[PDB]
Design a binder for this molecule. Structure first.
Ligand SMILES: N[C@@H](CCC(=O)N[C@@H](CS)C(=O)NCC(=O)O)C(=O)O
Length: 299
């Protein structure tokens, strides 16, 4: 049977707090599904190859990890069993057909949001984009996808906190608003916009706690949050600790990493592997990354 090596950074890594949450999700899924044995070791960077090697030497037949970008690059040439990294394989990583990725890459959500809005017959949306790095990545990805689908650019405006009038005028001519904007500014803008204009965002907006200013915003996020009656979502326990949405996403990532690992151990390749993931519907796409198709919700 299936022996999964769970090779993630130790507590003191800058990624160690995230790694512990991911581990707790992997464990939760293993306890429910009981389809595999876990072999857990801490490793990152300078020792990741050696400890990966020793996990394989000990009979591991699929691996979850690594987490850091730099560990992925160092490891790729040595990958000899199906290995599910939890970050992008960067451009510098060596090509290796047994190396796969599952991650929460934000561009994926932006692309989907453009597709959702097309489905919803938004003909002339306004894309509003913040100044922080995540928002700017989202906005580019949204805009590229919109252009691909519509064959014309989306109207795009830089958010201006000190002079919102021009944006409100542009928003008045639009049949929806797409936000790639930090949650604080998004809430301010939602309160200024006409109350009835459809407003959309990614999981960027779903931070947790009381968010009364964002009520009615349509967004995409994990089944784990949006679909309590999804068959996979229901069978796994919620985390013991109340987590931020950010962190709980990592717990859910752990659950699906476990589930994908079990399939990857049992398949000729990733290409035939699909999953009704708690993090989204999963299937292999570019860069041997499992892309995540997300349900819509209303804040
Ligand atoms: N490729 C990105 C940077 C790397 C990146 O976006 N990584 C994602 C996943 S590949 C991440 O930061 N975290 C997701 C996770 O580890 O779950 C860029 O355009 O700057």
């Amino acid at each position: 049977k299936v022996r999964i090596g769970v090779i993630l950074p130790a507590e003191s890594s800058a990624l160690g707090e995230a790694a512990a949450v991911v581990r707790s999700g992997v464990e939760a899924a293993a306890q429910v599904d009981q389809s595999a044995e876990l072999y857990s070791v801490d490793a990152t960077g300078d020792n990741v190859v050696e400890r990966y090697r020793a996990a394989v030497a000990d009979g591991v037949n699929v691996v979850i990890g690594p987490l850091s970008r730099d560990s992925i690059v160092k490891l790729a040439p040595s990958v000899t069993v199906p290995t599910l990294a939890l970050n992008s394989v960067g451009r510098e990583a060596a090509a290796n057909p047994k190396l796969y990725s599952l991650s929460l890459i934000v561009e994926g959500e932006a692309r989907q949001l453009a597709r959702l809005m097309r489905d919803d017959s938004r003909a002339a949306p306004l894309l509003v984009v913040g100044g922080d790095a995540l928002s700017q990545r989202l906005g580019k990805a949204f805009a590229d996808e919109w252009r691909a689908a519509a064959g014309k650019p989306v109207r795009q405006m830089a958010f201006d906190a000190n002079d919102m009038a021009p944006l409100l005028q542009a928003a008045g001519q639009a049949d929806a608003v797409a936000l790639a904007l930090d949650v604080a500014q998004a809430a301010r803008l939602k309160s200024a916009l006409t109350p009835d204009v459809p407003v959309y965002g990614t999981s960027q907006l779903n931070v947790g706690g009381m968010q009364p200013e964002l009520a009615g915003v349509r967004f995409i996020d994990m089944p784990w949050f949006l679909m309590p009656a999804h068959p996979a979502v229901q069978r796994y326990p919620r985390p013991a600790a109340p987590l931020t949405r950010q962190t709980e996403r990592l717990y859910a990532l752990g659950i699906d990493a476990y589930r994908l690992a079990v399939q990857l151990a049992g398949s000729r390749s990733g290409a035939a592997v699909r999953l009704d993931g708690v993090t989204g519907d999963l299937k292999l796409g570019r860069d041997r990354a499992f892309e995540r198709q997300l349900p819509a919700g209303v804040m």
